[PDB]
Design a protein around this motif. Structure first.
Motif, short mmCIF file in Angstrom:
data_model
loop_
_atom_site.label_atom_id
_atom_site.label_comp_id
_atom_site.label_asym_id
_atom_site.label_seq_id
_atom_site.Cartn_x
_atom_site.Cartn_y
_atom_site.Cartn_z
N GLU A 187 1.79 4.00 -13.15
CA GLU A 187 1.31 4.92 -12.12
C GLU A 187 2.28 6.06 -11.80
N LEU A 188 3.54 5.94 -12.22
CA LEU A 188 4.56 6.94 -11.85
C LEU A 188 4.91 7.88 -12.99
N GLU A 189 4.37 7.62 -14.17
CA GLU A 189 4.71 8.42 -15.36
C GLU A 189 4.45 9.92 -15.24
N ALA A 190 3.24 10.30 -14.82
CA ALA A 190 2.92 11.72 -14.66
C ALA A 190 3.91 12.46 -13.75
N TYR A 191 4.17 11.89 -12.58
CA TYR A 191 5.14 12.45 -11.65
C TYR A 191 6.55 12.52 -12.27
N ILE A 192 7.04 11.39 -12.76
CA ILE A 192 8.39 11.33 -13.32
C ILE A 192 8.56 12.26 -14.52
N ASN A 193 7.52 12.38 -15.35
CA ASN A 193 7.59 13.34 -16.47
C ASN A 193 7.70 14.80 -16.01
N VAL A 194 7.15 15.13 -14.84
CA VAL A 194 7.44 16.45 -14.28
C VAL A 194 8.93 16.57 -13.89
N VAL A 195 9.47 15.55 -13.23
CA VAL A 195 10.88 15.57 -12.86
C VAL A 195 11.80 15.71 -14.08
N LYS A 196 11.47 14.98 -15.14
CA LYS A 196 12.26 15.01 -16.37
C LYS A 196 12.23 16.40 -17.00
N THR A 236 4.36 11.01 -5.44
CA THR A 236 3.65 9.93 -6.13
C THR A 236 2.14 10.03 -5.82
N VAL A 237 1.82 10.06 -4.53
CA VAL A 237 0.43 10.16 -4.08
C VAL A 237 -0.25 11.46 -4.56
N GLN A 238 0.43 12.61 -4.42
CA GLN A 238 -0.09 13.88 -4.95
C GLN A 238 -0.48 13.78 -6.43
N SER A 239 0.43 13.24 -7.23
CA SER A 239 0.21 13.16 -8.68
C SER A 239 -0.96 12.25 -9.01
N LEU A 240 -1.05 11.11 -8.34
CA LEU A 240 -2.14 10.17 -8.59
C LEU A 240 -3.48 10.80 -8.22
N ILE A 241 -3.51 11.51 -7.10
CA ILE A 241 -4.74 12.19 -6.69
C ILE A 241 -5.13 13.26 -7.71
N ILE A 242 -4.17 14.06 -8.15
CA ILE A 242 -4.42 15.09 -9.15
C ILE A 242 -4.96 14.49 -10.45
N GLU A 243 -4.34 13.41 -10.92
CA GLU A 243 -4.78 12.79 -12.16
C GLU A 243 -6.21 12.29 -12.03
N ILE A 297 4.89 20.40 -9.23
CA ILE A 297 4.19 19.21 -9.70
C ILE A 297 2.72 19.59 -9.99
N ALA A 298 2.10 20.33 -9.08
CA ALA A 298 0.73 20.80 -9.31
C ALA A 298 0.65 21.75 -10.52
N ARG A 299 1.60 22.67 -10.62
CA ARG A 299 1.56 23.67 -11.70
C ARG A 299 1.55 23.02 -13.09
N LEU A 300 2.29 21.92 -13.25
CA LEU A 300 2.38 21.23 -14.54
C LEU A 300 1.30 20.16 -14.78
N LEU A 301 0.64 19.70 -13.72
CA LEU A 301 -0.39 18.67 -13.85
C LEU A 301 -1.80 19.26 -13.92
N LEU A 302 -2.00 20.42 -13.29
CA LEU A 302 -3.31 21.07 -13.33
C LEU A 302 -3.62 21.61 -14.73
N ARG A 303 -4.89 21.88 -14.99
CA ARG A 303 -5.33 22.34 -16.31
C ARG A 303 -5.60 23.85 -16.27
N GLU A 304 -5.93 24.44 -17.42
CA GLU A 304 -6.20 25.88 -17.48
C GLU A 304 -7.25 26.36 -16.48
N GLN A 305 -8.27 25.54 -16.28
CA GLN A 305 -9.44 25.92 -15.48
C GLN A 305 -9.25 25.73 -13.98
N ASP A 306 -8.14 25.12 -13.58
CA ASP A 306 -7.95 24.77 -12.18
C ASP A 306 -7.23 25.87 -11.42
N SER A 307 -7.22 25.78 -10.10
CA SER A 307 -6.65 26.84 -9.29
C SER A 307 -5.63 26.33 -8.27
#
Ligand SMILES: C[S@@+](CC[C@H](N)C(=O)[O-])C[C@H]1O[C@@H](n2cnc3c(N)ncnc32)[C@H](O)[C@@H]1O
Length: 280
Positions: free
Chosen positions: A77-86, A20-27, A103-113
């Motif tokens: 606040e949990l949608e991004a995370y839960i959508n990865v799980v789904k 949850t915290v990882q996803s919120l920070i990433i967003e 979770i990072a692989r699906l939330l990060l963008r093309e330009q991120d590392s």
């Protein structure tokens, strides 16, 4: 030596809090167009089979992710995370749980590392295959704590550093603190997210002492306990310590913790808190 297997614990209440915290920070990081680095010191296998013998032995996921992933009143606040799980359970049955690297692989963008390390000889090859042809990711079989020296600061000058050890060796309790101090020295504007277990409250108090002593400021503590503290009940709680938390994180956690705790702990035991270890 590396006898810990995260598959027993995957998707438990602690993973739910952590991710949850990882996803919120990433967003939050994605709110600026400029690229950022995701660094995962103890990355794990990438994804976990929940039907595995190891998961079902504990079956801890049954009391974690399972209690939230299909709730119709899921906090925004949990949608991004839960959508990865789904995404990893498109059949609607809970069979796989994505680790922090996915979770990072699906939330990060093309330009991120992504820079990921994992030492375990079963889990490393698995992690590597999760990232084939994803040129955004660098995956290494190396000591995670050493990356806080070797890979910071990122060329992008922005990032989330997730430090998530198993605490199989007691030395982790000191290593997380010295690691963070080394990282911070190199990259003081980084966002550092440290996960910790509460087995003995004693060791957490001491760890937090040592953290305070580094003189680092702006340190947020988020903790969810499913049971009150004890010295004979295994892990009764876990938390996320966040250095340089994003501007909205405290409020987001205040928004989502009561709901999370209510769903994860229907009996209402334990607690859930957000507070500052060191203010600005
Ligand atoms: C529980 S896991 C972390 C899982 C992952 N971060 C997630 O959220 O899905 C801890 C892992 O660290 C690995 N490990 C232990 N010591 C390590 C070290 N010094 N460097 C890198 N990996 C380590 C273990 O093999 C195990 O996979």
């Amino acid at each position: 030596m590396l006898s810990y297997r995260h598959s027993f614990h995957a998707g438990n209440h602690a993973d739910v809090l952590k991710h949850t915290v990882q996803s919120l920070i990433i967003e939050s990081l994605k709110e600026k167009d400029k690229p950022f680095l995701y660094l995962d010191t103890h990355a794990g296998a990438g994804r976990y089979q929940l039907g595995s013998e190891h998961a079902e032995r504990t079956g801890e996921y049954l009391e974690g992710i399972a209690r939230i992933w299909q709730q119709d009143d899921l906090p925004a606040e949990l949608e991004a995370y839960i959508n990865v799980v789904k995404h990893f359970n498109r059949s609607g049955q809970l069979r796989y749980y994505p680790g922090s690297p996915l979770i990072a692989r699906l939330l990060l963008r093309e330009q991120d590392s992504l820079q990921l390390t994992e030492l375990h000889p079963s889990d490393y090859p698995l992690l590597r295959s999760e990232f084939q042809k994803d040129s955004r990711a660098r995956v290494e079989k190396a000591d995670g704590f050493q990356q806080l020296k070797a890979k910071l600061p990122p060329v992008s000058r922005r990032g989330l550093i997730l430090i998530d050890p198993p605490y199989e060796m007691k030395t982790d309790y000191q290593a997380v603190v010295s690691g963070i101090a080394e990282g911070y020295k190199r990259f003081a504007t980084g966002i550092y997210a440290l996960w910790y277990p509460v087995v003995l409250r004693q060791q957490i108090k001491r760890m937090i002492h040592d953290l305070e002593a580094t003189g680092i400021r702006k340190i947020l503590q988020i903790e969810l306990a499913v049971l009150p503290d004890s010295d004979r009940r295994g892990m009764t709680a876990s938390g996320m310590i966040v250095i340089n938390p994003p501007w909205k994180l405290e409020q987001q956690m205040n928004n989502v913790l009561p709901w999370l705790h209510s769903k994860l702990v229907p009996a209402g035991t334990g607690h859930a808190t957000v507070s500052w270890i060191v203010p600005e």
